[PDB]
Amino acid sequence: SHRKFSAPRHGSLGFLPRKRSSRHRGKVKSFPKDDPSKPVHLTAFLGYKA
Amino acid sequence: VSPKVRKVLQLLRLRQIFNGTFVKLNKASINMLRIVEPYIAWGYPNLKSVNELIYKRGYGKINKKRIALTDNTLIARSLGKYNIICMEDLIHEIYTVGKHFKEANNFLWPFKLSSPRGGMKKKTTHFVEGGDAGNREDQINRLIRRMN
Amino acid sequence: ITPGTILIILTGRHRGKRVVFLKQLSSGLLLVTGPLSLNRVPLRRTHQKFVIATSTKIDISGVKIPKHLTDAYFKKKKLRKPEKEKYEITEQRKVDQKAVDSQILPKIKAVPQLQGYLRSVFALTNGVYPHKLVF
Amino acid sequence: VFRRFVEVGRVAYVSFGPHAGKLVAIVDVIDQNRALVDGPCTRVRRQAMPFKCMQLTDFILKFPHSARQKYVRKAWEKADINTKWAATRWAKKIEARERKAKMTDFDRYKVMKAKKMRNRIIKNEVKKLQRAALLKAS
Amino acid sequence: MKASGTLREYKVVGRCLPTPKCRTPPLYRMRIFAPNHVVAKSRFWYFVSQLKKMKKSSGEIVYCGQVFEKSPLRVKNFGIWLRYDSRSGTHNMYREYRDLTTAGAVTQCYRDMGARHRARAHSIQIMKVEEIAASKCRRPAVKQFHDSKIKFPLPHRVLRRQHKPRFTTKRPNTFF
Amino acid sequence: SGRLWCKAIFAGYKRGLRNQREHTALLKIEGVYARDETEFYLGKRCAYVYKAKNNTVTPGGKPNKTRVIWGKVTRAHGNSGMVRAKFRSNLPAKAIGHRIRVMLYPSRI
Amino acid sequence: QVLVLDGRGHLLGRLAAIVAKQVLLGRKVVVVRCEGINISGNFYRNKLKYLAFLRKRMNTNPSRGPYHFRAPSRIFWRTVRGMLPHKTKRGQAALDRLKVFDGIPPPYDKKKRMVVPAALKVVRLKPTRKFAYLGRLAHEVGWKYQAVTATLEEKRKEKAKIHYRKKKQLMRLRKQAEKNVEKKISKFTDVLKTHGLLV
RNA sequence: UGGAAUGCGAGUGCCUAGUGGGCCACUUUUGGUAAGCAGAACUGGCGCUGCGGGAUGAACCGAACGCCGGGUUAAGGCGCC
RNA sequence: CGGAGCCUCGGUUGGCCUCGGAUAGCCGGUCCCCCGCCGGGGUCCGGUGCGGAGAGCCCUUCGUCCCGGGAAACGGGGCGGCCGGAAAGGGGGCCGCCCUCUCGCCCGUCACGCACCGCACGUUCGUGGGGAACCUGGCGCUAAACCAUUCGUAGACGACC
Ligand SMILES: [Mg+2]
Ligand SMILES: [Mg+2]
Ligand SMILES: [Mg+2]
Ligand SMILES: [Mg+2]
Ligand SMILES: [Mg+2]
Ligand SMILES: [Mg+2]
Ligand SMILES: [Mg+2]
Ligand SMILES: [Mg+2]
Ligand SMILES: [Mg+2]
Ligand SMILES: [Mg+2]
Ligand SMILES: [Mg+2]
Ligand SMILES: [Mg+2]
Ligand SMILES: [Mg+2]
Ligand SMILES: [Mg+2]
C-alpha cells in the first residue's frame, strides 16, 4: 500500500557511494573550458586551510 | 483413433502408417473408405504401379508368415488351386480383379512402404483441399513412385 | 585418360608433378614417365584414383613401349633387415628409361612451352577452387 | 537522366533464366512486370518474360507492337543486330569472361608466364617515366 | 480449394444418372479453374449442387478436360465477375487483368483477391471470365497499358544477387 | 611444392535444435556457396590435422607432434554448399571453427 | 586473414547477422565507422527504442546491469553479441574475433574495406523509407565523441585524397608506359587477350 | 453353387491382485454475470508416457519407445542465436 | 645489442599499402578557359551491366649445369644520412657509399640430382609465443616496495595522511 503521508527522501542519491575518498588532495574533475581569445592564464591553485 | 475408424482400418489390414493394400471397389467397400477418409490416401493404380508394388515389395502370407516372393513355387503352392502359379498370374489376378482377387490379395501381406520421398502436402486435410487425405484417383500413382 | 595425357600426381613423394600417361597395366595401375629429365619422375606406376587427368594430350601413338614393362617389372623387391638395406636403380631400368624418354621427349618439345609446363609443380592458391576450373 | 527505355522493339539481353545470354526484342508490354519478347534470330520463342531477367541494350528495332514473328525477324536482320551486338564492348566483355572460364591448366600456365614478362617490361618502363618526371621538376 | 501453383481451365460436363422417368437427362457444362482435374471435378459438384437437385451420388461426370488457351501469344484484357465472402458479408466484384492465358488471368485474381481483401480461395466463386477489348476496360491500371507508343525506364534497379559475392570491395550501382 | 587441399571449416555437427548427431560433421568449403557446386567434392578425403604434446609416428617420416583424423565427404547439406562428412572417429568439439583439409582424391576427374 | 568491413551505409541488424555468422565460423572481423551505420525507420522512433532500453535497469542496484553503451561501435558490438551464444565458451571466442571502431583508426585506415551488399541500405531499403544514423542516435543518448571522431575523420579523408591522387598518377604512367612498350609486349598481350585476361 | 463385402483361429473353466479421490480437449450440454467455477453425453487423452514441434508447459500438434548404421519423412520450420 | 640445443603452447599452409562517395546516377581523361594555396569548377572526349572489373589485381617456387635468341643497361644484392608517421605514431621511398654480379625475368639447346620400385601427418607463417638453463662477446645500471617505528588532517581492525 502507499505510504500514508508524503515526505522527501533523506539524503541525495547523487553523492553515492558514501565511501572514503580514494585521494587526499582534491581533484579538479573539470577545468574551465578554454577560450583561445583570452590571454594565457592558470586555472587552479593549492591552498591550505588555516 | 476413434473406435469406428480403428476397426475399419484393421479390416483393410492398414494397422501401421504407410501400409498399403489393394481394395476392389463396390458399394460395400467404397463406404468403408469414406469412414477412414481422413486416415488414408487412395486412388486407382495403373499396371506399372501393380507391377512395381508386387515385384519390389511383394511378400506372401505363407503359413501365417511374411515370406518374400523370391520363387514362383511360393505362389503356386498357395494359389495354385486357383491357377495362379507365377508372379505374372498374381499381377493379372490383382490388376484385372479376377474371380479370385480375394484369395490372391489376402495372400499378399500388406505392403510396407517407406515415407514419401519429397514430402507430403498436408496429411491432415483432403487432397482436393491441397492436402493428402482421401481419394486422389490416378494421382495415387505419383505417390506410389515416391514411396515404393 | 588416353595415352599421352598429362596427369597430375596427387600422392607420394612426387605429388604435384605433371607426368605423361603411357598405358594402363594389366593390374589396372597406370604407367607414366616424368620424363625423368623434366621433373625427375621415372617410369613409375600410379593409381588412376590419385591423378587429375588434364585436357593436355600429346600424340604418342608412334611410341614403342617395351613389351617387358609389365606389372612384375615394377613390383617392389623385398629387402631383408637383420643394418638397413637401400634401393639400387638397376642398370636395366636406366636403359629402359632412355628407350621411352628418347621418343616421348622430342614429342614434348614439339608443343611450345610444354616442357616448361612439365617442369612446374601444380599447387592451389588464393581464390582458386577446383570445382571452378578446368584441367 | 535515363537513356534506355522499355519500348516496342527495344533489344534486351537476358541475364538469367532458361534463356540467359540471349538477345530478345520487346514485342509488347503486358503489365508493370512482364513483357512479350521474341528471339527469332537468337532461338527464343515468343513468350512472356519478366523485366527482372532483362538488361536493356542500346538497340531499338522498328516494328509495330504485337507484329507477328515474321516481322520481328525481318527488322532484326535489316539492322544486323547479331553483328552489331558482337561489335559492342558489352559482347566482348562477356566473351572475355568465358574464354577465361574455360582456360585449361596448361593454358593457365602459359598466361602466368606471359603475364610475368609483360608485367616486368611495363614496370621497367614505368620506372623510366618517373625518373624523367623528376628531371622536369628539378 | 487451394489455388496452388498456376490454375488450369477445365471443361466439366455432368448429368443426373438416368432413370426410368427420364432416361436421357440433360448435360450440364461448367468452366472450372483448378490446380488439377481431381480438384476440378470436386468443384463442379459443388456448383451444380448449388444450381440443381444434383450431387455426386445422383449424377456423374461425363467429360473432364483441360481447355487450352487459344491465343497464348496474344496480350488480352480479361474481365472477371466474382462473388466472395468477406468477414461480414458477401460481395460481387468485377476485376480486370492483362495476361496471355485465361487461366493465368484467373490465377492473378486469386493472388490479388488474397492480397487486397485477405480472401481465401474457398470463399471466392469465379462466375464469368470474358476477354475484353481495350475500349471497354474500366480499371485505370489496365487502361494505362493501352498505348501503342508505351515507353518507360527501369529506375533504381535493386541488386538481387546479394550473396554472390557476399563481401565485395565496391558498392553496387542501381542505375542502368 | 604448394597446397594440395581445399580449405574447409568445421561448422558443427548434424543436429536438430535439441539433438546432436556427432557421427556426422557439417563442413563449410571455401568457394562452395551453392548446392550445385558441391558435386566435385563428394567422396573426397577429409583430414582434421592437429598437434599434441606427445610424439607420434609418421608414415614415410619420423615421429612428430602432428596427428590427423581422416574422413570423407558423404553428401551435400542444404542449398548453400555445405557438405556432410564422416570421420573414423567423431571430431572433438574443440575443432569447431577450425580448418578441415579436403583433399583432391579419390579423383573422379 | 582478417575481414575488414566499412560501416557506412549498412543496416545495423543485417550487418550483425552476417558478421555474427562469420565469427562463429572462426573468422576475424573488423568493422570500422560504426557511427556510419544506419537503422531503418525514422530517427525519432529509433531514438524512442533506445530510450526505452535506457529505462531497463535493476531496480535495486542499477550498477549491476544492463549496461547501456552509448558509443555507436559498442551499440553495434552489443547487437552482434545478441546474435551469438555468448554464455558458452564457443560464443565468447567468436565474440573475441570481432573488433568494432568509431571512425577508421590505424592500421585499418590504410587498408581496403569490404562491404556487405546484403546489408547495404541502398540495396535493402526502398528509397522513400526513412532511416536513422547510428552516430546521431548515439550522440543524443550520451555519446561524447561525435565531434572528435568527425574531426579526425576529416583529417583521414584529406590524407586519403592525397594518396588517391598519387594512385591516379601511377595509373596514367602505366597507360602511357604500355603505349611506349606496345611493340615489345605485343606477343605477351595476345596471350592474355586469347584467354580473356585482356579485353 | 456353405447362399453379401472385408478381415480374423476360436471356444471354455478355475484362482485372482490393484482400483473404487480423477482430471483435461473437439463436439453436444445444465446451473451461474462469469471463472483455470460446479454438473452431464460421446470419443480421445493425461493419470501410467517417453520422443519431434508449440521458446517455456501434465493434456495442444505430430508420433508412441528393444541397442544400432544408412535413407526418408510428420507436425513444424530455413536472417543470427 | 649480437650460438647450440631442451621443454611447453598452439593454430595457420601466398599477398592486396587506403579517394570520397552517388544510387532518378556514376567513373576516367582533357586544364585550351575560369578560380586557389600542384588543387577545384567549366568545356570537350571516352567508358557505364562498372574491364582504370574484388566476376578483380599482384606474386608464382623443382634445383643446377652448357651455349643461344629476346628483355635490361635509367639494372639486381649489399653499408651511412635528410624529410616523412600521433586516433591505437612507419624494418616505405629518397640521396650517397668503397662494396657486390652480370644470373636473376621470357623462348630455346644440354644434359644431370636417391629414379627410394602406386599410397597418409607432405608444402609456409618459422629465427612463432612462453619457460628454464648451457654457453659466448660488446655497452651499460647499481633501486624500491612492505613490515617495524612515528603522525592524527585517519581510524572498528585493515586502510589512509
Ligand atoms: Mg503519494
Ligand atoms: Mg532429399
Ligand atoms: Mg486432430
Ligand atoms: Mg552518465
Ligand atoms: Mg481413496
Ligand atoms: Mg468440470
Ligand atoms: Mg473441483
Ligand atoms: Mg495416481
Ligand atoms: Mg493406457
Ligand atoms: Mg503420450
Ligand atoms: Mg508459446
Ligand atoms: Mg536414422
Ligand atoms: Mg526454430
Ligand atoms: Mg604444420
Coordinates of C-alpha atoms (C1' of nucleotides) in Angstrom, one line a residue, chain I residues 85-156:
Chain I
rG85 C1' 54.0 8.9 -39.4
rA86 C1' 50.3 10.6 -33.1
rA87 C1' 43.1 8.1 -33.3
rA88 C1' 45.9 2.7 -31.1
rG89 C1' 52.6 7.2 -34.2
rG90 C1' 56.5 3.7 -40.5
rG91 C1' 62.2 -2.7 -40.9
rG92 C1' 58.5 2.7 -47.3
rG93 C1' 60.5 5.7 -50.6
rC94 C1' 64.7 9.4 -51.5
rC95 C1' 70.5 10.6 -51.6
rG96 C1' 75.3 8.9 -51.0
rC97 C1' 78.8 4.6 -50.4
rC98 C1' 84.1 1.6 -51.0
rC99 C1' 81.5 -2.6 -52.0
rU100 C1' 78.7 -6.5 -55.0
rC101 C1' 77.1 -9.8 -60.1
rU102 C1' 76.2 -9.7 -64.8
rC103 C1' 72.4 -14.9 -63.1
rG104 C1' 68.1 -13.4 -61.7
rC105 C1' 62.9 -12.4 -65.7
rC106 C1' 60.7 -14.8 -71.2
rC107 C1' 61.6 -18.6 -75.6
rG108 C1' 65.2 -22.2 -76.8
rU109 C1' 70.0 -26.0 -76.6
rC110 C1' 72.3 -29.5 -72.9
rA111 C1' 72.1 -33.0 -70.0
rC112 C1' 72.3 -34.3 -64.5
rG113 C1' 70.0 -34.7 -59.0
rC114 C1' 68.1 -41.1 -54.2
rA115 C1' 64.7 -42.5 -60.4
rC116 C1' 63.7 -44.6 -52.6
rC117 C1' 60.5 -49.5 -57.2
rG118 C1' 51.2 -46.8 -56.7
rC119 C1' 49.9 -45.0 -51.1
rA120 C1' 48.7 -40.6 -45.1
rC121 C1' 50.6 -36.0 -40.9
rG122 C1' 53.7 -33.5 -47.3
rU123 C1' 54.2 -27.7 -48.8
rU124 C1' 54.7 -21.8 -45.2
rC125 C1' 53.7 -18.2 -41.2
rG126 C1' 59.1 -20.4 -38.9
rU127 C1' 64.7 -17.2 -36.3
rG128 C1' 56.2 -18.4 -33.9
rG129 C1' 54.6 -17.4 -28.3
rG130 C1' 56.1 -18.8 -23.3
rG131 C1' 59.8 -21.4 -19.5
rA132 C1' 64.3 -23.0 -17.9
rA133 C1' 69.1 -23.3 -18.4
rC134 C1' 74.2 -24.0 -21.1
rC135 C1' 77.4 -21.1 -23.4
rU136 C1' 79.6 -16.6 -26.0
rG137 C1' 81.3 -11.4 -26.9
rG138 C1' 80.1 -5.6 -26.9
rC139 C1' 77.9 -1.3 -23.9
rG140 C1' 75.6 0.0 -19.7
rC141 C1' 72.6 0.0 -14.2
rU142 C1' 73.7 -0.2 -9.1
rA143 C1' 66.6 0.6 -6.8
rA144 C1' 62.4 0.5 -4.4
rA145 C1' 58.2 -1.7 -2.0
rC146 C1' 56.1 -3.9 2.5
rC147 C1' 56.9 -4.6 7.8
rA148 C1' 58.7 -2.2 12.2
rU149 C1' 58.9 2.9 14.4
rU150 C1' 56.2 7.8 14.2
rC151 C1' 51.7 11.3 12.9
rG152 C1' 46.4 12.2 13.7
rU153 C1' 44.1 16.1 8.6
rA154 C1' 42.7 8.9 9.7
rG155 C1' 40.5 5.2 12.0
rA156 C1' 36.0 -1.0 14.5

